[PDB]
Amino acid sequence: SAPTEVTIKSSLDEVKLSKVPEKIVTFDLGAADTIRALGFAKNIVGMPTKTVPTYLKDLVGTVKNVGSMKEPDLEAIAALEPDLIIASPRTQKFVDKFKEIAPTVLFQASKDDYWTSTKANIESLASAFGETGTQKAKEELAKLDESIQEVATKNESSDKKALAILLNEGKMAAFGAKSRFSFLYQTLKFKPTDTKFEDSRHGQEVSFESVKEINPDILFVINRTLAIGGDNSSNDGVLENALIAETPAAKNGKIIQLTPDLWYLSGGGLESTKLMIEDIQKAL
Template identity: 40%
Template sequence: MSKKLSILILTVIMAVLVAACGAGNSNNTNTAPANNTTGAAAENTAANAPAEAAETAELTIKHQYGETKVAKNPEKVVVFDFGVLDSLDKLGVEVTGVPQANIPPYLEKFTDTKYENVGSLKEPDFERISAIQPDLIIISGRQGEAYEELTKLGPTIFMGVDANRYMESFEENMKTLGDIFGKEAEVEQELAAVEQSVADLKAKAEASGKKALIILAQDGNISAYGPGSRFGIIHDVFGFEAVDPDIKVDTHGQSISSEYIVEKNPDYLFVIDRAAVVGGESSAKQTVENELVKGTKAAQEGHIFYLNPNYWYLSGGGLVSVSEMVNEIAATLE
């Protein structure tokens, strides 16, 4: 083989080797950015994971009928309890459906057609609720019998107030709403204000030494309510001594007569006119203030008070309604 041919062959071999090395370096350069892109995607996925988890987070809510898993910040909410409704409104939380029959005047905004009418307090419209496909349904005592059926339509929780521990259960309900809707700080602030107003009222009521009787009037009939009853907050929390501590605790109260009122002779007589909010003949004043009752201390001293049944009978247990109940009783001591 000639010297020139040998040099030529060597030159070709060297060129091939250089080209191969160049190709190898080119592959390595392209691979690195690909790996970096994958790393960035992984970082983004990890960063987004907590946000996605928060959006789909669930809470387990314990209530009178058991435990219910509820999504954090539910969007489609159906509310059957007016106390809960006034609380959500106070906290700036929108709802989807409400029972528009018998809505208290202070919640009149919820009669607007933008809100779905889901029936009445005692008769939910299951078909309408089903069409909503709610993320959460909130009920209280009047819907107790419908609980099982409602659970088939969406997560359902009971948020009624326990008359035996009114303020404790009220505060628990409000904190639950705070947890569900991310309004914990707002709820704490509202509860602190309510607690202070209750403490002020209780101090005045106890200092007055006055004994009170609470009655519900309906179409000529009268029922009495004492400590531990649905209206017993006046005694148990607000500080008025009961003129009769042995009144039977019953949802419908203890049936009484005018003679009973005369016998007990209360200093303060608090009257709730049921007919004024549920229909019927609203004649509480005529029923209560007859010739017999006019001789009692309450009547003689101008201490017969007709409480707002929208707060006391239809609603109650809400941030707005409880505050108004406190204000109403406090005003009787001024």
């Protein structure tokens, strides 16, 4: 076998390649956005195109469609002759099938040390593109580290408490400091409310009375329905309910409608992290 030139650590077995991969299939959209930010978008040959966040739309034309965020088209993947497949938590059930086709990685973040683990994943992926990738990632990560510190410093000067909810077909689910939205709390140092929420990936259902009682100063909202292109009519009037409209968050202009597709479908990449930080400036 040819000698190893690049190595990629992840939650899976370390992948060792004899050259930079030029035919990549990815189900991880953050990884796609990292690859593009590093200057290697041409190397991505397959991505699911059923539900693509707007910020990534221009990659649709340069890839072949390999299915949906949860359901791969294995025939389409094999036909692309990939030299690397980037799986995702959502597609972990297909990792054995992916491995039959090509070396496969799957990046996982800690819910505790979200940013250190995410940076390690970004650096590992970037190294697949040699010194050029590694150098560019160092440069871009330095800017993100500085932006993160600036946000964290502002939050550390405040005592406001922030509640984070997912809105889905008129149902509200609250999420805690260690959750799919850890970046807000662990990394950016928004402060959670005193109410702890069953750490489920779908959150804990909350009523209008619950939100009133929590009494948040900032309310982050991720609208799942909009993120996936559903009928948003079921969410009409939810945030406008008097019990939410009378929170200090609402009255003070701190209901923050986070870009739905970015936050629900992506994250963990160089560009997605940058855009996420931009999105929360109005919450400071």
